[model samples]
Target chain A: MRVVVIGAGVIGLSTALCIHERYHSVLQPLDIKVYADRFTPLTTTDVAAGLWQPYLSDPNNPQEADWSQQTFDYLLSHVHSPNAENLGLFLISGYNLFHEAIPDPSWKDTVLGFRKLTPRELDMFPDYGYGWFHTSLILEGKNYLQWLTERLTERGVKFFQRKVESFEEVAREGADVIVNCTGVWAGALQRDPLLQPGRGQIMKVDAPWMKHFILTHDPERGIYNSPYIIPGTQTVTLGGIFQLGNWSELNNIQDHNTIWEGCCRLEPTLKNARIIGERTGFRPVRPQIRLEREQLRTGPSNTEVIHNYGHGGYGLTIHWGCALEAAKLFGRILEEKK
Target chain B: MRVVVIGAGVIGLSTALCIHERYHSVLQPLDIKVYADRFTPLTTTDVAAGLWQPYLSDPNNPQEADWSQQTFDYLLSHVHSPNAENLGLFLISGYNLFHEAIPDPSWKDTVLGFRKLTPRELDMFPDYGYGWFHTSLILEGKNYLQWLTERLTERGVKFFQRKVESFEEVAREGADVIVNCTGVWAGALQRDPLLQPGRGQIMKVDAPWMKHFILTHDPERGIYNSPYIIPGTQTVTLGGIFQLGNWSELNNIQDHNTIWEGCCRLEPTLKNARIIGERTGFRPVRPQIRLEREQLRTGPSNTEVIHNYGHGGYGLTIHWGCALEAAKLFGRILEEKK
Candidate 1:
């Protein structure tokens, strides 16, 4: 089976790896190719804090929760892996402080040591009335992406550093399968109105003292409610702004101050954290993650394309599960044609 | 007089400011224009820590010392200015620790509180044998550049965001005087063999607890001797790697580790410093600064171009002095033409 993936982001690489694992041996000489204009350090995923939380995802979608659980399990298994440091995967426990009373999250059972925060814990966050604590996973997106690319190459998956403009172009080449995981660009590529650029700006600071993560919805924060502090291997990621429909990539100093002030309010020690860098990217947001197959017919032949994108802030949260689903969908497509 | 400055770096902006100050009114409408493909945040000056020190500079040049003193005086005058914060200018005191016996720096008298470190002070840094305590000024390059550009604009100096290929291009256009302050690019522009790109990488970290800077030359560090810690307004700048002739902009993780280890060795507290960002730039290095006038004859017209660049890492240290010299040279060129 011949397959081409149209992104080098977390989703594309993960989906490529899954397809390779599933069909590389079963389908003799199952060749996989990945195409992207840019790779790590340039990908939107590279800027992500990589905290395992299904944030801003479709609450009604049971599949989203399933994906989140599977991704969590996968990351948990890697915590003890010999390449944990290189893979930049680790378990971090933290509180999700909420301003108002809220029900338990879908993956409450999936995370380790999940429990409601004590009233004493709530006292520390005066602005928040409810909270929960859980041990979650964090992945350094840049490191993880690099690791993914290396593993994919080792498995004979070739990568082409080129932009794929349209499905017609790839379809003309007669690929057995094509996976579209273009993130925010998929909206433009597919011209899908359901997708919008959810602009976000984050700062990576050197704060080794910040061992735990802090996700808060403080009442006093007003419009900027969700302030998070995620500890990664090398730096702590503090974020962010989720300005939906806004596509500006400029690092606004005003927003920088807002994130700094908000994060510092939750973890006051962050005030002493030295800023390593600031990054801005438009998260590929949609009402639901597009994880279905597309059939593109050009003249004589039909081309099968599986789309797995628009994971938004939850891309890292559910990428592994989405990749697995896409791979399965690829198999079903092949079986139906056969 | 219609003057055109060939760069928008610290030297270019400073030279333009100085020229506007000297001859804007005296020359009637002055009509000064600055041209560069990049400005402010994009300039090489933007990456600098802007610490006022003459490192890797020509030691035998008396003018260099004079320039350093003048620049220091200028920054001191602005410490109490209304735009001090916006200018990102501040005074910080620190120790320059040395593992071997070293003579006093020429600017010992120029800096405040020029005193040798006591035996007790040396005892604290076990890896060092000699040291000096002094207060120095630091300028945040991005902020300062913005301030300079604003001031220049207010003074009626026009800015052109375009690259100049050669002196002949501006000379043929009948620019009465042109000032060259193109930093490292001047090496390619003028094809001067003495000029070399001194590639340097530095990290900006959030270490609010760090109030003072630390300059140290520890013996164990080998080739990586000069590891300095400079505290700025928003972030503390920890550096650096100075590889001459290497032009690659890829931030090497190995170099990052070296800087981190070297800096942490100097001030162990820095180990707790959260990295905000890392930047790489090639310092415009030459055996001696080329700050003089070049008479480019284009047909019947003669264009007086003042060359002011190649301060290497000391561009910020002596930018004002070079600008002053360039302004004076501009006056001499006008007189000769008349």
Candidate 2:
């Protein structure tokens, strides 16, 4: 079978893994290649803070909850596992501070140590709203990406770096099936009007002292930075503002300072942290996460395309989940043909 | 037959064009793929000033003269042709000024308008050495790279951007032959001790009014700059510093300002030129540019391998000629096998 995946983000790589691993029996003697326009630091997934939460996922996509839960279960299974720890995956407790009432957690039942913050704990911030303690999975993106690449290579998945201009081009490569995970460019190839960009920018810094994760929203100070103070393998990330439809990739000094001060306000030790690098990306925001099997026309032919994108900022949160769903769909297509 | 070229720089792309163009009859039904770790902007070729001069070819490589002459003739034929303009190829007269007596120009007979400078022209600089005028080919690197890429795509050459860690890994992709034009990485793959890096850093700017190219080496001032002020399609590049065996890719502000100030001395209009961006690359410097046929053992079996790399800084000046040579070698190998 000739299967091609068209993206290299967490979603695309995870999907490649899921399909190759799950369908090994049937997809034996498979020729799988990933084609991406921009990889690594240039990918939209790089702009994410990589904090595990169900945020910015399209509410219209009903499968995200089931998908996210499956992904969560898969991640939780990796606690203390050699591979996950090597990739910097760990469960940590942190407060989700908000300007309003703390939102109810849909994943409350399965997640570890989910509870409301104590009055004394809330008194530390003295901010108007509320806080909730949630124990969740955190991944250092740089390490995770390297780990994912290692896994793909060990399994013999070929990677091609090129922008797919049309579906006909996929057919030209003799692909029996194509996985459209082009992220923001996904909507662009189809010229779909419903897809929008969920732009986010984040900065990385090396501060070993930071251990716990925190999310704060100070609306009045116009400071809605995700005090995304999560620890990475080499550096910690402080992120960021969210803008819809902002396609600009330029890093701004004004916005960076706002993020820096926002994190420093939450943790004074951050004031001494050295700024390493910053990245900006436009998340593909569909009305809902799109993971569907469709018979599409491109060039002068019809192709079987399984689109698995539109996770937006929640991609890292539920990457494995949607990938599993996509894998199942691929299995169904194979069985139907069989 | 499946043939793979493992670099996307000028050398690899030019070779791809040459092979597919030359081996039309016998190499029918050819499947050619170009795999590169980092495409364009990141390739070492990006750091080239694109000044057509044999700056750093090994003195022992006698073929460089014949190879360079062939390339020079090909470039001259493109002077008034549509292909050359589209490829951003042009002819410009430049001053090769040195701190001592003028060395013998091996290319004096072949190059156009090669002559000693007039007494007034020599006195105008009045440094320590004599000067000569050599009219040679100049190209806008960015435009030429884009043109090369377009030509490859038009010819159905597929490009994959991935670091090839081992030649054995490439054969696993089912390639009958691999054309190794991976620049310095080729030597590194084989753990060959002879291959060294020829480091060069150049900056591009929008100083379009600068028309003349001047190379200066002031021993007392401890300054040596290409004075290669050839106008590009969008910007003018001040020729830069070349260091052999240096691995650092950092762009120094001090060196850049010196380059800027040095160019401003030659063409004062450049003082107002806006600095666009800087690139640093390690040119793969081998004792002699390697272009030969070899049998390579890899996963599962033996594969025909054509080694075409180690051009150092003279890649742009003789890319087509070397590519043509490699193509002829490819034909000879096939003939021997038959």
Candidate 3:
């Protein structure tokens, strides 16, 4: 049972596709390795926006909203069947707009169709009195994380790119189990000082007459606007600004003109929409989001770590319920260390 | 009367700084030759988003809404003063979220706090009912288009980088008028079958808590998810997809996981961010935005063309009212050809 998933992002490829789909039917011939310095449209989940929405700034409550609502109900029951669109999942329609008046009732039974907004639809924008609605399921993480790394390399799983720098070089590569998920480089591997790095910037437009999914919150200078239309993909994703611990990634012509004049003052028909490009990403925060189960030892093989990294922005809203609770704690640490 | 300004973006440097602030104190050595081929973070107004809104697919009558409300009140009275932050302007804060429910009576007396978003602030999102609000200005086109090309090359303005396959090769260097902005490579200059090309794709991240600005919409699966958080910048611009006449600009891991799982379901704090890179652009649409006048009778020199390119994405939101209407139609065609 050799396993090693250090980090390929999206929480080390969803914990190595949840420990290679539960020990690829038994074990023995199941050896997995996923190192990852960078892969798939260049990871950080390719500048993620894999939305599931649940941003806890930090207070250390490691259950991660019940593993992001059990990885959003296992990707909302296979996104839209057909083998979840050939494993790229589907079903999209999500919005969130608030300026004030949301007293929060814990997402009224965990989001589904959480309605509200009538007053003739608040005079359609008599300058927003408030709003909300629902219908979610979207995991197009660039073809579902390369269709989960080509289904974990067609179930043989063994991808490595190096850059480990210790845990004794992943226990000299013999690896019994090491899952870390190195987000934010896990503070350069376990140095931990509450691992940081959070900075994001974006823009990619071509509004095919925008479809739906919007979020807003701008009560006189607080700032927040959301517009995401992706159905058959004509490309309408405009956004954003969020700066914290900014570790410079360049491109800041006044933060790209305050995010393209705040997205053309919220859709003046994207003011002739057709801008196509500009980006940046850096998020690996940590104040709590680790997962658990260590046992490094050092001598005759005692390496089983299943930690699961921080998951700051709800890694795809609980990437498969935290990889099925780190594959049921790697099967109770392989039956209490045999 | 020598005045040339082919294209340096931001509407050929705000129409060569409004025709060098209207012929630099009465046309003294006003040989403004800017040309193109690339400048600043590589033109296209250095990957725009320099807002000021306006262009609901144009033809919004009333003379393009009074030139987009007089270029948004002359960029809100010089963005941050000090000569609009040294001509790069700033002062930003905007939001717009709608799924259905919008009736913005032409920017209530022209933007500056025009509000809406109450119903307990639109229920804080289960999806998005509707919302809107405004207060704009954000033209940091890479340090104000390289500080208006170094203050029009310290009042002498003559910068060419080649690639002018003809407008009679920029009227054989000695010009009297030729102002074509050339965006989307103007279909390799003049093949105007009403020109085309509107492809966009971006992803740059490193979320710094995401200060403000967010947009999301899902109008029956046309797809929209705006994620912006810009405030003194820390890189938080995640986006987009719009493919009209697709023109490959590379970067595709399935459009980078459909723009990172549609922005991790609209702000899951961006599932551990850190992606810093990915871009693409090609927006020079057409069908009128050309400003007028083109007469290049090559042979014996008699070239007078001033067609200010079609602004696909509101070339920086009607860049200075279309550079003061292409400098008052290039001063009424040099006062009826002198």
Candidate 4:
């Protein structure tokens, strides 16, 4: 099948990788292309924390949860492997400290080695009274995404650096199947009002002494505490504040100071830590992740399309699972047409 | 003594204002020439989060603390004034949420209304056990710096758009005292090994709903939190990672993702924030904030110079205080020589 992916975000890249891997034999002669306005460090995936946790998803529907679980399983299975390590994949212990009791019951079962910290262990933190501990994988998006792209290119995936304005224009290029993974831009592309942009900002600091992930919540001000130490990296990711519907990309000094002071309070050792820089990315958020197939009549030929996007903050957490599900849907559509 | 200041970073412009304001009728027409490659949004101040907090300074020493206090007082006195508001100055409530108790009392008496959060307030936070609340001021460096330059210009302070390679060249142009505020380029000036670049990268987002200041600490990890949101401004500043000595200006995807996820986790409301663009600036960090007076013997005359640079992250916070001190030193030097 001649398939074309309309984005290079985690969703688009993951989908293309899965399809390329699945149809290796039958699609050797297939013309596959991935179009994006930017690639690698410019994609939304590059700005993600790559934590295997789902923050905003409807638990009543098992779709997102299942995808996350599957993605976590895939990463967990290969995280310790030589290949995964080289690709910036590693398992680290993480804590989700909540001010209120966590509502999600499935969280314990979803993440590996999940449990509540003992009273003695909890005393290590003098301020908070409640917390949860778990071991999960942290993917370094920079190194890993580049590694994934390199692997994809080595396997013969054609990448085009161009912005697509219309579906008809993309169809004119003679693509048999078009996959939409435009993330927030999908709103402009598919005209889906459900897709929205979530602005996220983080500061990277060189705190090599830190090891492990830590998350604290503030329910009153709707602000949360985050100071994550990803294993195998000298840079600790400090962040962040979430402002919905915000589109500006300027650094606020008061915010930066608050972050620095807060983090130093959490870990006094960080008081001496060297601050690297600041970064901001918008999460391509939508009310629901889309994974479906459609058939479109283009001129004299019928075109098959698969849409798989809108994973929001959980893109990295549920990437592989969503890719597999998308591939399965694409396969079903192919069978139906046949 | 006549003086000329080059560059308009926190140091240069502040120095010019101080010299002009203090020497008023006595000094030789005090022509403060600000030579900049770009002004306003194109300058480094535009990309900085200007807050009045001392980071990476000696907590026990009274000098850095005094500088911060004086600057804070100056800003607090004028931040709400009519002209100050027009220049983007505002007072903001700030919090530094951490996992452990604070070890120092350096800022105990300096900052206003500084106190620890009550048990009830602490309970509102998830994993964190400790936090401090203080009232701080933010200088929208981008706007305020330009306003400052304009105000100075109206008072006869000349601004020249030129890159000067040597201090001798400036002295030859009839500048009795040359104050250097070259920031990261100080290395190119006097080969001061102490003046190294602390590269900070940040992403500017348009999130108007973010109010107040929030910061957090991630125990074993490091600093994390979204910057304080300045009200009424469409652009919210997000950042940052501290990469010392690394000067690459391009945005990296991995850094972007970590920032995105971090911010989203901090403020769930940011799930809808839009990202505008990413920016990077090299902070002129040195062992001490440079404020020194020196004499250079040129062919036919002795050129007096006051070197004021290297405030690091605290540039805007301590700009005026240092400038005032530089001016005082200039007066002493002129009196003693005569």
Query: Which candidate number would show the highest TM-score if scored against the true structure?
Result: 1
Instruction: Give the RMSD in angstroms, all C-alphas superposed, for model 1.
Output: 17.9
Candidate 4, residues A206-299: lDDT per residue as tens digits? 6532435767667554433343333234367787566667776666776677677766655555565567878777777776787878777767
How many angstroms is residue B28 displaced in model 1 relative to the true structure, after the best TM-score fit?
A: 74
User: Model 1 over residues B86-130: C-alpha lDDT tens digits?
Assistant: 777766666688777777777876775456776745655678888
Instruction: Give all TM-scores, in the order shown.
Output: 0.50, 0.48, 0.29, 0.49
Task: Give the per-residue lDDT digits (tens) of candidate 2, residues B97-119.
Answer: 77676466677765665666655
List DockQ, one per candidate, in order: 0.01, 0.00, 0.01, 0.01
Docking band of candidate 2 = incorrect
Model 4 TM-score is: 0.49
Sorted by lDDT, highest first, which candidate order results?
Answer: 1, 2, 4, 3
Q: Which model is ahead, 2 or 3, in terms of DockQ?
A: 3
For candidate 3 chain A, the 10 contiguous residues with the lowest summed lDDT are A223-232
Fraction of the real A/B interface contacts present in each candidate?
Answer: 0.00, 0.00, 0.00, 0.00
Question: CA shift at A302, candidate 4, in angstroms?
Answer: 4.4
Residue B317 alpha-carbon offset, candidate 3, angstroms: 5.7
Q: lDDT, candidate 1, residue B96?
A: 81
Worst 10 residues of 4 chain B by lDDT: B223-232
lDDT of 1 at A226: 70
Query: Model 3 segments beyond 4 Å from truth?
Result: A1-50, A54-66, A69-102, A105-128, A132-139, A158-316, A331-333, B1-50, B53-70, B73-338
Q: Rank the candidate models, highest TM-score first.
A: 1, 4, 2, 3
Candidate 3 lDDT over residue span A51-114, tens digit each: 5656413235746667777777777655424355444444444345554566543433454544
lDDT of 1 by residue, A1-338 (tens): 77889999999999999988886675355778998999998989998988788752235567888888899888876554445656677656667888778777677777765667766456556678888866677877898899999999899889889887788777777677889999988865678898888888999987653445778864443223478887676677899577888888899988898899888777665666679999999888787898998787766788888988888678988989999999899879767966
